Ligand binder design. Sequence first.
Ligand code: A9O
Ligand code: A9O
Lengths: 115, 108
Amino acid sequence: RVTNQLQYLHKVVMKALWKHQFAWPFRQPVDAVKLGLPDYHKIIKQPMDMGTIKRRLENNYYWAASECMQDFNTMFTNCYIYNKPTDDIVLMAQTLEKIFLQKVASMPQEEQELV
Amino acid sequence: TNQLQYLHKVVMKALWKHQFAWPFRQPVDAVKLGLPDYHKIIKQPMDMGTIKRRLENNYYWAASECMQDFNTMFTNCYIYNKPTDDIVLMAQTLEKIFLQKVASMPQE
Ligand SMILES: CCc1onc(C)c1-c1ccccc1
Ligand SMILES: CCc1onc(C)c1-c1ccccc1
């Protein structure tokens, strides 16, 4: 569907996060071969990234805004679970997620489809 | 505010009573749990008891500020614990409810 909330997530949330200076590691799936992480998919069972979320928003994949929000959440949570506390990537994730939450605070309150 | 009232009476109430919520209702007690490295790794402790008290005492100026505290609580859990620890699954479950409920908060 196309809803007011999903439009907000696309036009405000994804817009802000996609172009952020710390976004680059999150713009495509974690490539375990490229990064040399043979345990990544053993630990992270549901990979998620902003390229996938962006494509899903562009293709009207989501039925509800909550579904998109859960994908954002999974992406960040995967990062915190896999990486060491002191890794820079954790700081980058935290910075992006703070923006996510700040913007989500102003999202339309009721979901409804555009005719 | 309208949003802070919602975070207190709708969001926090639902999370608080959940069967996986008990570890999160008060600060992590590193002494009781025997974890000398907890406060060396987690520099901003947060829990729902602290958030609830802040809501009750009008500490927050905006809903976003309160939401950030919820996020810090969950993130601390993911950062400190092993991926396979049950507490991680408990946090994930509560976090999903948090986002579900936040989606329906008044927009202002
Ligand atoms: C295992 C490292 C890692 O964990 N989460 C992300 C994102 C990354 C990442 C880091 C650098 C480039 C691309 C992804
Ligand atoms: C260090 C373990 C831990 O990490 N986050 C929480 C919450 C807990 C916790 C686990 C059991 C009881 C109380 C808190």
